[PDB]
Recover the amino acids of this structure.
């Protein structure tokens, strides 16, 4: 609403096109080595045999200018086509579904996107998730119990200083370590960083 | 195209505004080069430092981290790479970012990915011991983390050997950097042929401006000057168009490099 | 003042380091205060507290909306030779 200059790309595309047309038109007023830049006068000032020479000069100059203009247009069109292909991919992947490739649309974990129209382009509003308010903890890679080693099915072990819990990785939410969120593999004599603790199972108290 | 001659400039003045367009195109190309480098490398907000004590579960990054001993603060591999690859109205402008700054970006990115993982690419860098970051990365390709904790030393040794092998391959085997050399050679050849084109008559009586200017009558001297002028304009326009094509191709390559940096360095693909 | 990019007059060199306002070259650029010229600063500086048994876990979150702008078209023009 207030801040300007946020639409530089569309604006400068328009400016480039307008400047190209302006210089192409303004090139019409050049002698190119002839006696005048107006065709009617040189037609009406001297006999044909030299008029053909003058028209030849004018014609070659204007042809060169036109060819230059067209070549520039082709280059710019190729660039715009590349941009449009990128926009189509972004619309298909970030608007019609949730994307996993990092930083493709938005900085952070992508949640969704919305499109809006603009005079010669498109504007994507990316809605993303950003974690905050960190906190440090002490961690271990596995837990010893009865000589066996336990690893978390999903999450990570942490301790606040006295007790150990498992949490999901992206949001602090501790839970008691149980035989339902951990799995066993071999004895604990090879892993570097194992810590002693206890793992509670929810069947023994129920049975009694 | 005039080489400090009043008559040439006066005769050229009636050709409209041609070389203004050429200067505009070249300026656009240079600005694009700076934007390319900025987009590829300035992927981070802060500048991270690796801790003085280095115990990454047995992994060894000494060959890739910078060493304070050298003044450029570059790494071993970067020094190998830098050693392997090696006026008439035209100028070469220096890049905006000097080499030390680019090395500093690379060092920051690499320290961040060693210590934090992919977290520093989304929010604030969060520390994580390297072994369990590797366990997470195994978990993302279909292998249980269990495996890594029981084959840690073997994995570390394999990684170290691979690093040493790639270092030796770069150090001994040459011609591994063909692309950069090709770019440099193409630019040099184009500039050289543009310069050498100045020694052509293009149908006039001499390829030197002073002799034709100071030998005979102006009335036809202007015709000779016109011959020289049109030839040199054609050469210059051809040069500029080639430069534009090459710039477009390089920009495509740089966009690809930016995507690869974003997707394979700051995350797991 | 003399710089690797050339010779600069009308501004004074300082020993500070801020962000880059008007890029001059060779890693230096200028800004207005009088006009001063300085060396770029790549950003802030921090040393993340690495250790082999310490982790950091977020406790809260924010939801951010950002914008991206892409051109997709340009004006269609046509030229008549013989009339031009
Ligand atoms: C670590 O967390 C545990 C679990 O929340 C804490 O242990 C309990 O803390 C509450 C609150 O002080 C007490 O009412 C309970 O009696 C504690 N024990 C149990 C078995 O619930 C522990 O205090 C925390 N320690 C630190 C340093 O934060
Ligand atoms: C974490 O790192 C510290 C320091 O690098 C380790 O502490 C050393 O452990 C070894 C073997 O356990 C001892 O021989 C040293 O005397 C210890 N030194 C210090 C200063 O503590 C610690 O063992 C590591 N922990 C894990 C789980 O890898
Ligand atoms: C965790 O528990 C194990 C077993 O309860 C401990 O291992 C014993 O340690 C004592 C003293 O260090 C030795 O005399 C025993 O031979 C060890 N084995 C057994 C089966 O008792 C271990 O020290 C405890 N602590 C840690 C950090 O692992
Ligand atoms: C990481 O690998 C490098 C390989 O270069 C080790 O550096 C070598 O260390 C040995 C042992 O002192 C020396 O004999 C070599 O001269 C070193 N090579 C170089 C090029 O300096 C380094 O020691 C390894 N890291 C650790 C912690 O051992
Ligand atoms: C988590 O605890 C560690 C251990 O203290 C913190 O690392 C240092 O903490 C002290 C305060 O106890 C600070 O003065 C240091 O600056 C910290 N180290 C560094 C390199 O900055 C760590 O900062 C704590 N994490 C958080 C988020 O506060
Ligand atoms: C997570 O952050 C939000 C803010 O983004 C916290 O909500 C604020 O809480 C304070 C104190 O209760 C209020 O004064 C603010 O008005 C709240 N903001 C909003 C937008 O509602 C929230 O408390 C944080 N989570 C936790 C667990 O503290
Ligand atoms: C800036 O630092 C240099 C050396 O780093 C020193 O010689 C100079 O006196 C300092 N001040 C100014 C104004 O240059």
């Amino acid at each position: 609403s207030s801040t300007a200059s946020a639409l530089g790309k569309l604006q400068d595309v328009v400016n480039q096109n307008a400047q190209a047309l302006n210089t192409l038109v303004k090139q019409l007023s050049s002698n190119f080595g002839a006696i005048s830049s107006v065709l009617n006068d040189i037609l009406s000032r001297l006999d044909p045999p030299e008029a053909e020479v003058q028209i030849d000069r004018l014609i070659t100059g204007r042809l060169q200018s036109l060819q230059t203009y067209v070549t520039q247009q082709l280059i710019r069109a190729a660039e715009i086509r590349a941009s449009a292909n990128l926009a189509a991919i972004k619309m298909s992947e970030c608007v019609l579904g949730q994307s996993k490739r990092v930083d493709f649309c938005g900085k952070g974990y992508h949640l969704m996107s919305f499109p809006q129209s603009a005079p010669h382009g498109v504007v994507f509003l990316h809605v993303t998730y950003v974690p905050a308010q960190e906190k440090n903890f002490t961690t271990a890679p596995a837990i010893c119990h009865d000589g066996k080693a336990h690893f978390p099915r999903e999450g990570v072990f942490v301790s606040n200083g006295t007790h150990w819990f498992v949490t999901q990785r992206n949001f602090y939410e501790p839970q008691i370590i149980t035989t339902d969120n951990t799995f066993v593999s071999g004895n604990c004599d090879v892993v570097i960083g194992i810590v002693n603790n206890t793992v509670y199972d929810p069947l023994q108290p129920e049975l009694d | 195209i005039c080489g400090d001659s009043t008559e040439c400039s006066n005769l050229l003045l009636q050709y409209g505004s041609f070389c203004t367009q050429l200067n505009r195109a070249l300026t656009g190309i240079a600005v694009e080069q700076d934007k390319n480098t900025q987009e590829v490398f300035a992927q981070v907000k802060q500048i991270y430092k690796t801790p003085p004590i280095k115990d990454f579960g047995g992994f060894n990054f000494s060959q890739i981290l910078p060493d304070p001993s050298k003044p450029s603060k570059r790494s071993f591999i970067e020094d190998l790479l830098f050693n392997k690859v090696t006026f008439n109205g035209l100028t070469v402008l220096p890049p905006l970012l000097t080499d030390e700054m680019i090395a500093q970006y690379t060092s920051a990115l690499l320290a961040g990915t060693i210590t934090s993982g992919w977290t520093f690419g989304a929010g604030a860098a969060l520390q994580i011991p390297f072994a369990m970051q590797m366990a997470y990365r195994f978990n993302g390709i279909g292998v249980t983390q269990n495996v890594l904790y029981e084959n840690q030393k073997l994995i570390a040794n394999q990684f170290n050997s691979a690093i040493g092998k790639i270092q030796d391959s770069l150090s001994s085997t040459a011609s591994a950097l063909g692309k950069l050399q090709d770019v440099v050679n193409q630019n040099a050849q184009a500039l050289n042929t543009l310069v050498k084109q100045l020694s052509s008559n293009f149908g006039a009586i001499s390829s030197v401006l002073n002799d034709i200017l100071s030998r005979l009558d102006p009335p036809e001297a202007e015709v000779q000057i016109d011959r020289l002028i049109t030839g040199r304009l054609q050469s210059l326009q051809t040069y500029v168009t080639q430069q534009l094509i090459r710039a477009a191709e390089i920009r495509a390559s740089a966009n690809l490099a930016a995507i690869k940096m974003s997707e394979c360095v700051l995350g797991q693909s | 003042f003399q710089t690797r990019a050339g010779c600069l007059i009308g501004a004074e060199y300082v020993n500070n380091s801020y962000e880059c306002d008007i890029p001059i070259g060779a890693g230096i650029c200028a800004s207005y205060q009088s006009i001063i010229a300085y060396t770029m600063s790549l950003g802030a500086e921090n040393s993340v507290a690495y250790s082999n048994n310490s982790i950091a876990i977020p406790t809260n979150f924010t939801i951010s909306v950002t914008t991206e702008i892409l051109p997709v078209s340009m004006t269609k023009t046509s030229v008549d030779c013989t009339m031009y």
